[PDB]
Amino acid sequence: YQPTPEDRFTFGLWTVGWQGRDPFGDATRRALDPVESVRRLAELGAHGVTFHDDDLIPFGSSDSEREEHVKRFRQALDDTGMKVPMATTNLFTHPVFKDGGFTANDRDVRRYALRKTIRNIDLAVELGAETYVAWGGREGAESGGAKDVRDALDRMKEAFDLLGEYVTSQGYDIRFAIEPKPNEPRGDILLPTVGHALAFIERLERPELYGVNPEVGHEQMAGLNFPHGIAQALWAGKLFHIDLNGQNGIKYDQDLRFGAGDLRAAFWLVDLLESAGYSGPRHFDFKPPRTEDFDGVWASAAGCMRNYLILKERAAAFRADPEVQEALRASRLDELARPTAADGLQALLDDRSAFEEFDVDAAAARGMAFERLDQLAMDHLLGAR
Amino acid sequence: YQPTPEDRFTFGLWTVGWQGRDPFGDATRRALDPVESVRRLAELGAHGVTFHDDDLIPFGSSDSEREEHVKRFRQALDDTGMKVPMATTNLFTHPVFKDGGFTANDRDVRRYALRKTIRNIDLAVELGAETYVAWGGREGAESGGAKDVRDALDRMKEAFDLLGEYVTSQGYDIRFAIEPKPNEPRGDILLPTVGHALAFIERLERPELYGVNPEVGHEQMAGLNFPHGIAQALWAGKLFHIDLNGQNGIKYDQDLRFGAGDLRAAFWLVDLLESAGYSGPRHFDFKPPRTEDFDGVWASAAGCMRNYLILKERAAAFRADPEVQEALRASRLDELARPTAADGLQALLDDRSAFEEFDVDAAAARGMAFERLDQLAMDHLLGAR
Amino acid sequence: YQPTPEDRFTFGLWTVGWQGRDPFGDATRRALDPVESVRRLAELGAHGVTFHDDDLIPFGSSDSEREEHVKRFRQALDDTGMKVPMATTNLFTHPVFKDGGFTANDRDVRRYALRKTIRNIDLAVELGAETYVAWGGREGAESGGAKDVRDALDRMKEAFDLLGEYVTSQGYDIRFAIEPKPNEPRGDILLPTVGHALAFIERLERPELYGVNPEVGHEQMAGLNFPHGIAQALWAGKLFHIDLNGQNGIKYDQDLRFGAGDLRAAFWLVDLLESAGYSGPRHFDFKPPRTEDFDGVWASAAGCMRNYLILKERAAAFRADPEVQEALRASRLDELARPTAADGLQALLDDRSAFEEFDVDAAAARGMAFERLDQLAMDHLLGAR
Amino acid sequence: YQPTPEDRFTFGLWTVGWQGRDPFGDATRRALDPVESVRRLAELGAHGVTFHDDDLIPFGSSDSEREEHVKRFRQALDDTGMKVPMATTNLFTHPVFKDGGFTANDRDVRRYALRKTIRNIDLAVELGAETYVAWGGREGAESGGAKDVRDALDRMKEAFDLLGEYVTSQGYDIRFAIEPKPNEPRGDILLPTVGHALAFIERLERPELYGVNPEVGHEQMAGLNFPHGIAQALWAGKLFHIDLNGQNGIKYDQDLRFGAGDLRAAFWLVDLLESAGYSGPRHFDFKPPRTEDFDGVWASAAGCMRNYLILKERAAAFRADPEVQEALRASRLDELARPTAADGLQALLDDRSAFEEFDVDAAAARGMAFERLDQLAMDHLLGAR
Ligand SMILES: [Mn+2]
Ligand SMILES: [Mn+2]
Ligand SMILES: [Mn+2]
Ligand SMILES: [Mn+2]
Ligand SMILES: [Mn+2]
Ligand SMILES: [Mn+2]
Ligand SMILES: [Mn+2]
Ligand SMILES: [Mn+2]
């Protein structure tokens, strides 16, 4: 289960670089130089890294400081063969963003948020990023009067439309991926799920430029089925990027290593990504727990990739097993994939087999055989076949 | 706080008619004749009633039985002046629907589900319904292999497209409202939130025919902000209908009377519906607790309407209070409603006040004054001004 | 992974006998004769069965009907070698219990609940049960004024004290196991967790007669760590019985087969039961999904036992692996098991190494190595070592 | 609704002093001098303040620095008449506590945690505190192998027993209050609810010295009924202290001002505290949102006390209303408070009215009238009578 760069595993600088500060806790690890993170991730068999602007270039850097930070980072990428497939803006840490970036009540803050984003889009394109993620972590409210959500969605549409006008004006190939989260750090965050983000994108001026960047733990913070949400994103043609991690249900955002948290959901996610032929990065947005030293950081990062590769093997073995193929037919997964009424509406209306002569009791009596299918899935996951 | 028919309060037959059967419990009340429910709701000042097909006409009724059930119901509507603004199909109770209606793995069940729906659309139009709700309560899974969600969404789109072709073919004015729910009775339900339903509708052949029927308790079963979801539905132009009730956060679907459960969310919901000029029914999809006798049923129904009218008064007083209007300006709700960059992208890029000369620390220091605003909202809700 | 009767696997009659009625759904399966359930469970390698009074003897049975039901059941036990280690009372289904049994506001209902329980304690003892479970599913409220919880806990203590006086008066060896659940069917249930039940037992007149019957899904409906709660019950000496099933976090009570739901929690539960030498029944309180026919019922029941046996193997292999034993020492699990201050309070106060000369920074720098340990646990669970 | 010092409202230094750092965010407010907080809280009509050791005396202070910090604080208390009813230890912020204080796997850390606590118990007693709170926020795990919970509970009992031996040895009157929380910052925290903490206390060597310090938001993070948990703590005689705040259900710990979050739960909590004659501090453990400036900090603190006083008025009016007293009898709250069987077990067994001649159908038919009672409660809360 040894990852290489072909497996397209990527990590945020902020993941292995997390110093362990939490709502109740000071740092437990020293800051990592991005150069060291690129080297150590490459040694583990990562394909690439991603960054917020402020991960790579300290906030308030001079042009000369910015140039030197990017030069050193570029040299580490060159030394290792590591890629940068995705970049994003920090519109959440600085206190100026305490009520939002794109949907701050203060108009001057909204304008600044856009300029900060646009500066980093240029850098993302220079470093070869195909995807530009937006996580509006400060967009939302703790109280009902603070935020008129129709006005906020007007401001959010304006911001994303301006970014689309910018990338079109420059002739950039980069596309946007909106990252939903239901809450934390705001009491409620706007576009709280994959569904809300997909729906919003349909009302942008150039919807083709925008998709989603769903995160395992974020949908699970609303108690939702992450594989189901990824299936709806794939169905819409909008899975531009994905964030992989672990979460133990409806809590604060844990950012456990991938495979931790809901293990069976991780299995069905990998099964879906691989069956669908998702071709994007397998990106880990996780935090090595603050209990760990740097040896534990690299162990946790290695475990992200290991767990993906184990689950990939077990899901492929499940789908390829003739006994599973028979069980899928027994459960009418083949019939689910057939059109209901390719004969058309009038034929359906005229079909006595669909109403007057439909034996509801005979149909009702037919077991779905889902438990046998699911125990074959369990046996494959556990290597108990 | 006395409701009349102008307040457009409506109730499902299945709400006050709930006999109190639950996963662990037999009925605690006798069946209600729909005629008696129409009479008793009219006496409380309801405007109208809604029905599933199988609430009004027992499943498996003869044509002569169907005619007599509808005749008696029509006479009760005529006697009272009660309306029927909305109807819906029961695609969940009968064991034939144990794996779904429109997304059953069995194709013959999908075809039957459509025929059952179409028969009741005709009846809905006869009784003057403007909205036809679809709650796909059986669409989903308890296990990952049982349901390929891309195939299921293909079947769901086919079904809704066929219903749109049907209503267009007949020249009906009736529109559809998809009701999301995240889980229960299925382990996970497809289109689990307002966002997922809005996103799905954008991929139908005639999206203009479809909106959402959000339910307070359903979004709250995913821990979501119901007023925020209603704001996104309004923003999309898709709030065709609404279900009002109470829920105590992330649990089984409680269907408490409206105002019970999350009282402050009920306040901000009424504030939003009234401010937005929502013109649809104020429909209660609730269950008088099975502790109650019929006197408690009618008390619980009366309390739905009373709580709406109290919250309407308090929200209107909040918005009209000059001290609140001042607090809204202090919190820059006025600025939230102003375009970010009506000057356009190039002007924004050229604006030094948006980047090079933006005083981030001065902006960051400016308090949002949200707590004062929210305590004025609390004082108005509690009548403590 | 073939279960025999030595593995002490037991099932409720109501589990495989569940006809599939849910809040939104009619039965999908015919009623099972308890005789058939005993035969089919024995063939799967179960050790025994458990019952509510009303599972074995229809409510309102004559003495002659009661005798015949028990005779037939006894013959099936004799035919198979199946045991009855546990029995319980149905104080939830009949509408008389709509506000509770032991904590009904109506005193006449409380008295009836006790008489119904006492009659079934006699039968439990006749059939050789060692444990008598009480799940107060109707004890609680949907509203704040309906139930004064101090008065209700007074009535609950009276009821359990009277049952203890009864079993003492008869010279029965049977002990009680209180089953917590946080909600469903009541909006909130009294004694909602293992902790609340343990705390309550300490205030009974004969606490030694009472323990807990924790259920996987019930603690998980409060988002709690089920293995941690079982550890506290073991620590208290109060794990008299356990209910095994699956749950997907904070939802309605799913009662999935054991191993479904939170698979890693199932692993750590089996690890704890086996490491602690828990000697009680491995009882499954689950519901084959209503999608299934009888073949799926028996597959789901078989899967409960299979998953326990797979997880038992993997947990034993984890604990026996010298690499894991080394990792446990690296993570100071050995030090956790050592007394903090066997030297006593005065020695601790006088120990400069504990304060004035404690190198907080050196201690803080020491990694816990928990991620390496947890990935060895993951590798063992998945058979990827 | 103007608070005075008689209302016994208290605040942590860390509440109004919270600088607004969150998992995703830098400080939005400057540090407050405790002297300024004591002055500003006194002006709002607070009775007193509480502290962690490290709130009052910076970690790593010299004896001379410690003396000056305490002198200045004492002068502010003297200037204002403010009390210090409660103090506590910070066993969570410093990275040395990354795996716990009392249940750290490292024994040297456990010993240090005890010495740090004992030093602050002395200071608490000097400043007149009656209660010493322990919130074991770092006691727990993110992974199953990291923490053997039976061993951890052995270490937790040792620590609390040593603290009890210490206060007994010194002749201090101060008592301990254990503060449960289910998760955050650990993936799962030991003693996650009021029930678990009550149960644990019964196994300490001197249980009379220990109670609970329940926090509104903490029980609500497990989806539990906070008034019900407070009722069980009162029933046990163990409500030594309480933390008041707001929470919007199952999320990260929000620490909203009291009355925010679940408003009806706040109503039923105040009703219970006042009806029970709870005599302890009404302590607010809240965080003014980081959106706020210092004017918003003091508004949020004022709103904590205002909301308590409004709810106190409305609950008293509810209980005193003859129509409510009649409704409580109609719902048999009077019967709930009567013993089930003061006639004794044998009389109950011999009572045909309790079984053979109990009319279950007549009892079942009797409505509980809970919805009318609850709408009187709603009308009182909203001032709509
Ligand atoms: Mn996350
Ligand atoms: Mn992410
Ligand atoms: Mn509902
Ligand atoms: Mn509904
Ligand atoms: Mn259960
Ligand atoms: Mn159970
Ligand atoms: Mn808190
Ligand atoms: Mn607290």
Coordinates of N, CA and C in Angstrom, one line a residue, chain C residues 137-263:
Chain C
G137 N -38.8 3.4 28.0 CA -38.9 4.1 26.7 C -39.9 5.2 26.7
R138 N -40.9 5.0 27.6 CA -42.0 6.1 27.7 C -41.8 7.0 28.9
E139 N -40.7 6.9 29.6 CA -40.5 7.7 30.8 C -39.8 9.0 30.3
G140 N -40.5 10.1 30.4 CA -39.9 11.4 29.9 C -41.0 12.3 29.4
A141 N -40.8 13.1 28.4 CA -41.6 14.3 28.1 C -41.3 14.8 26.7
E142 N -42.3 15.5 26.1 CA -42.2 16.3 24.9 C -42.2 17.8 25.3
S143 N -42.6 18.1 26.5 CA -42.8 19.5 27.0 C -42.3 19.7 28.4
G144 N -41.9 20.9 28.8 CA -41.3 21.1 30.1 C -42.2 21.0 31.3
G145 N -43.5 21.4 31.2 CA -44.4 21.4 32.3 C -45.0 20.0 32.6
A146 N -44.9 19.1 31.6 CA -45.6 17.8 31.6 C -45.0 16.8 32.7
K147 N -43.7 17.0 33.0 CA -43.0 16.1 33.8 C -42.0 16.8 34.7
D148 N -42.3 16.8 36.0 CA -41.3 17.2 37.0 C -40.3 16.1 37.3
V149 N -39.1 16.3 36.8 CA -38.1 15.2 36.8 C -37.7 14.7 38.2
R150 N -37.6 15.6 39.1 CA -37.3 15.2 40.5 C -38.5 14.3 41.0
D151 N -39.7 14.6 40.8 CA -40.9 13.8 41.2 C -40.8 12.4 40.4
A152 N -40.5 12.5 39.1 CA -40.4 11.3 38.3 C -39.3 10.4 38.8
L153 N -38.2 10.9 39.2 CA -37.0 10.1 39.7 C -37.4 9.5 41.1
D154 N -38.2 10.2 41.9 CA -38.8 9.7 43.1 C -39.6 8.4 42.8
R155 N -40.5 8.6 41.8 CA -41.4 7.4 41.4 C -40.6 6.3 40.8
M156 N -39.5 6.6 40.0 CA -38.6 5.6 39.4 C -37.9 4.8 40.5
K157 N -37.4 5.5 41.5 CA -36.7 4.9 42.6 C -37.7 4.0 43.4
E158 N -38.9 4.5 43.7 CA -39.9 3.6 44.4 C -40.1 2.3 43.6
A159 N -40.3 2.4 42.3 CA -40.6 1.3 41.4 C -39.4 0.3 41.5
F160 N -38.2 0.7 41.3 CA -37.1 -0.2 41.3 C -36.8 -0.8 42.7
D161 N -37.1 0.0 43.7 CA -36.9 -0.5 45.1 C -38.0 -1.6 45.4
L162 N -39.2 -1.4 44.9 CA -40.3 -2.4 45.1 C -39.9 -3.7 44.4
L163 N -39.3 -3.6 43.2 CA -38.9 -4.8 42.4 C -37.8 -5.5 43.1
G164 N -36.9 -4.7 43.7 CA -35.8 -5.3 44.5 C -36.3 -6.0 45.8
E165 N -37.3 -5.4 46.4 CA -38.0 -6.0 47.6 C -38.7 -7.3 47.1
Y166 N -39.3 -7.3 45.9 CA -40.0 -8.5 45.4 C -39.0 -9.6 45.2
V167 N -37.9 -9.4 44.5 CA -37.0 -10.5 44.1 C -36.3 -11.0 45.4
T168 N -36.1 -10.1 46.4 CA -35.5 -10.5 47.7 C -36.5 -11.4 48.5
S169 N -37.8 -11.0 48.4 CA -38.8 -11.7 49.2 C -39.0 -13.1 48.6
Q170 N -38.8 -13.3 47.3 CA -39.0 -14.6 46.7 C -37.7 -15.5 46.7
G171 N -36.6 -14.9 47.1 CA -35.3 -15.6 47.1 C -34.8 -15.8 45.7
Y172 N -35.1 -15.0 44.7 CA -34.6 -15.1 43.3 C -33.2 -14.6 43.2
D173 N -32.4 -15.2 42.3 CA -31.0 -14.8 42.1 C -30.9 -13.7 41.0
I174 N -32.0 -13.5 40.3 CA -32.1 -12.6 39.1 C -31.7 -11.1 39.5
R175 N -31.0 -10.5 38.6 CA -30.6 -9.0 38.9 C -31.2 -8.2 37.8
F176 N -31.3 -6.9 38.0 CA -31.9 -5.9 37.1 C -30.8 -5.2 36.3
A177 N -31.1 -4.9 35.0 CA -30.3 -4.1 34.2 C -31.1 -3.0 33.5
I178 N -30.8 -1.7 33.9 CA -31.5 -0.5 33.4 C -30.9 -0.2 32.1
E179 N -31.7 0.0 31.0 CA -31.3 0.3 29.7 C -31.5 1.8 29.4
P180 N -30.5 2.6 29.3 CA -30.6 4.0 29.0 C -30.9 4.2 27.5
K181 N -31.6 5.3 27.2 CA -31.8 5.8 25.8 C -32.0 7.3 25.9
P182 N -31.5 8.2 25.0 CA -31.6 9.6 25.3 C -33.0 10.2 24.9
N183 N -33.6 9.6 23.8 CA -34.8 10.1 23.2 C -35.4 8.9 22.4
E184 N -36.7 9.1 22.0 CA -37.4 8.2 21.0 C -37.8 7.0 21.7
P185 N -39.1 6.8 22.1 CA -40.2 7.6 21.4 C -40.6 8.9 22.1
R186 N -40.1 9.1 23.4 CA -40.4 10.4 24.1 C -39.4 11.5 23.5
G187 N -39.7 12.7 23.6 CA -38.9 13.8 23.1 C -37.5 13.8 23.9
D188 N -37.6 13.6 25.2 CA -36.4 13.3 26.0 C -36.8 12.2 27.0
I189 N -35.9 11.2 27.1 CA -36.2 10.0 28.0 C -35.4 10.2 29.3
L190 N -36.0 9.8 30.4 CA -35.3 9.9 31.7 C -34.2 8.8 31.8
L191 N -33.1 9.1 32.5 CA -31.9 8.3 32.5 C -31.4 8.1 31.1
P192 N -31.0 9.2 30.4 CA -30.8 9.2 29.0 C -29.5 8.5 28.5
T193 N -28.5 8.3 29.5 CA -27.2 7.7 29.1 C -26.8 6.7 30.2
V194 N -25.8 5.9 29.9 CA -25.1 5.0 30.9 C -24.8 5.8 32.1
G195 N -24.3 7.0 32.0 CA -23.9 7.8 33.3 C -25.1 8.0 34.1
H196 N -26.2 8.5 33.5 CA -27.4 8.9 34.3 C -27.9 7.6 35.0
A197 N -27.9 6.5 34.3 CA -28.4 5.2 34.9 C -27.5 4.8 36.0
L198 N -26.2 4.8 35.8 CA -25.3 4.4 36.9 C -25.5 5.3 38.1
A199 N -25.7 6.6 37.9 CA -25.8 7.6 39.1 C -27.1 7.2 39.8
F200 N -28.2 7.0 39.1 CA -29.5 6.7 39.7 C -29.4 5.4 40.6
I201 N -28.7 4.4 40.1 CA -28.6 3.1 40.8 C -28.0 3.3 42.1
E202 N -27.1 4.2 42.3 CA -26.4 4.4 43.6 C -27.3 4.9 44.6
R203 N -28.5 5.4 44.2 CA -29.5 6.0 45.2 C -30.7 5.0 45.4
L204 N -30.6 3.8 44.9 CA -31.6 2.7 45.2 C -31.2 2.1 46.5
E205 N -32.2 1.4 47.2 CA -32.0 0.9 48.6 C -31.1 -0.3 48.6
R206 N -31.0 -1.1 47.5 CA -30.2 -2.3 47.3 C -29.4 -2.2 46.0
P207 N -28.4 -1.2 45.9 CA -27.8 -0.9 44.6 C -27.2 -2.2 44.0
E208 N -26.8 -3.2 44.8 CA -26.1 -4.4 44.3 C -26.9 -5.2 43.4
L209 N -28.3 -5.0 43.4 CA -29.2 -5.8 42.6 C -29.3 -5.2 41.2
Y210 N -28.7 -4.0 40.9 CA -29.0 -3.3 39.7 C -27.7 -2.9 39.0
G211 N -27.7 -3.1 37.6 CA -26.7 -2.6 36.8 C -27.3 -2.0 35.5
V212 N -26.4 -1.8 34.5 CA -26.9 -1.3 33.2 C -27.0 -2.3 32.1
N213 N -27.8 -2.1 31.2 CA -27.9 -2.8 29.9 C -27.7 -1.8 28.8
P214 N -26.4 -1.3 28.5 CA -26.2 -0.3 27.5 C -26.4 -0.9 26.1
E215 N -26.9 0.0 25.2 CA -27.1 -0.4 23.8 C -26.2 0.5 22.9
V216 N -25.5 -0.1 22.0 CA -24.5 0.6 21.1 C -25.2 1.9 20.6
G217 N -26.4 1.7 19.9 CA -27.0 2.7 19.2 C -27.5 3.8 20.1
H218 N -28.0 3.5 21.3 CA -28.6 4.5 22.2 C -27.5 5.5 22.7
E219 N -26.3 5.1 23.1 CA -25.3 6.1 23.5 C -24.9 6.9 22.2
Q220 N -24.9 6.3 21.1 CA -24.5 6.9 19.8 C -25.5 8.0 19.4
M221 N -26.8 7.8 19.8 CA -27.9 8.8 19.6 C -27.6 10.1 20.3
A222 N -26.7 10.1 21.3 CA -26.3 11.3 22.1 C -24.9 11.7 21.6
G223 N -24.4 11.0 20.5 CA -23.0 11.3 20.0 C -21.9 10.9 21.0
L224 N -22.2 10.0 21.9 CA -21.2 9.6 22.9 C -20.4 8.4 22.3
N225 N -19.3 8.2 23.0 CA -18.3 7.1 22.7 C -18.8 5.8 23.5
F226 N -19.3 4.9 22.7 CA -19.9 3.7 23.4 C -18.9 2.9 24.1
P227 N -17.7 2.6 23.5 CA -16.6 1.9 24.3 C -16.3 2.6 25.6
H228 N -16.2 4.0 25.6 CA -15.9 4.7 26.8 C -17.0 4.5 27.9
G229 N -18.3 4.6 27.5 CA -19.4 4.3 28.4 C -19.3 2.9 29.0
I230 N -19.0 1.9 28.1 CA -18.9 0.5 28.6 C -17.7 0.5 29.6
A231 N -16.6 1.2 29.3 CA -15.5 1.2 30.3 C -15.9 1.7 31.6
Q232 N -16.7 2.8 31.6 CA -17.2 3.4 32.9 C -18.1 2.4 33.6
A233 N -19.0 1.7 32.9 CA -19.9 0.7 33.5 C -19.0 -0.5 34.1
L234 N -18.0 -1.0 33.3 CA -17.1 -2.0 33.8 C -16.4 -1.5 35.1
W235 N -15.9 -0.3 35.1 CA -15.2 0.3 36.2 C -16.0 0.3 37.4
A236 N -17.3 0.5 37.3 CA -18.3 0.6 38.4 C -18.8 -0.8 38.8
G237 N -18.4 -1.9 38.0 CA -18.9 -3.2 38.3 C -20.3 -3.5 37.9
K238 N -20.8 -2.7 36.9 CA -22.3 -2.7 36.7 C -22.6 -3.1 35.2
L239 N -21.7 -3.7 34.5 CA -22.1 -4.2 33.1 C -22.8 -5.6 33.2
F240 N -24.1 -5.6 33.5 CA -24.8 -6.9 33.8 C -25.2 -7.5 32.5
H241 N -25.4 -6.7 31.4 CA -25.9 -7.2 30.1 C -25.5 -6.1 29.1
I242 N -25.5 -6.4 27.8 CA -25.2 -5.4 26.8 C -26.1 -5.7 25.6
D243 N -26.5 -4.7 24.9 CA -27.2 -4.8 23.6 C -26.3 -4.3 22.5
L244 N -26.1 -5.2 21.5 CA -25.2 -4.9 20.4 C -26.0 -4.7 19.1
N245 N -25.7 -3.6 18.4 CA -26.3 -3.2 17.1 C -25.4 -2.2 16.5
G246 N -25.9 -1.6 15.4 CA -25.3 -0.5 14.7 C -26.1 0.8 14.6
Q247 N -25.5 1.9 14.5 CA -26.1 3.2 14.4 C -25.2 4.2 13.7
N248 N -25.8 4.9 12.7 CA -25.0 6.0 12.0 C -25.3 7.4 12.7
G249 N -24.7 7.5 13.9 CA -24.6 8.8 14.6 C -26.0 9.3 15.0
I250 N -26.2 10.6 15.0 CA -27.3 11.2 15.8 C -28.5 11.4 14.9
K251 N -29.4 10.4 15.1 CA -30.6 10.1 14.2 C -31.6 9.4 15.1
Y252 N -32.7 9.0 14.5 CA -33.6 8.0 15.0 C -32.8 6.7 15.3
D253 N -33.3 5.9 16.2 CA -32.7 4.6 16.5 C -32.8 3.6 15.3
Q254 N -31.7 3.3 14.7 CA -31.7 2.5 13.5 C -31.7 1.0 13.7
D255 N -31.0 0.6 14.8 CA -31.0 -0.9 15.2 C -30.4 -1.7 14.0
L256 N -29.4 -1.1 13.3 CA -28.7 -1.9 12.3 C -28.0 -3.2 12.9
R257 N -27.7 -4.1 12.0 CA -27.0 -5.3 12.6 C -25.6 -4.9 13.2
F258 N -25.2 -5.6 14.1 CA -23.9 -5.3 14.8 C -22.7 -5.3 13.7
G259 N -21.8 -4.4 13.8 CA -20.7 -4.2 12.9 C -21.1 -3.1 11.8
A260 N -22.4 -3.0 11.5 CA -22.9 -1.8 10.7 C -22.9 -0.6 11.6
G261 N -23.1 0.6 10.9 CA -22.9 1.9 11.6 C -21.5 2.1 11.8
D262 N -21.1 2.4 13.1 CA -19.7 2.9 13.4 C -18.8 1.6 13.6
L263 N -18.1 1.2 12.5 CA -17.3 0.0 12.5 C -16.2 0.1 13.5

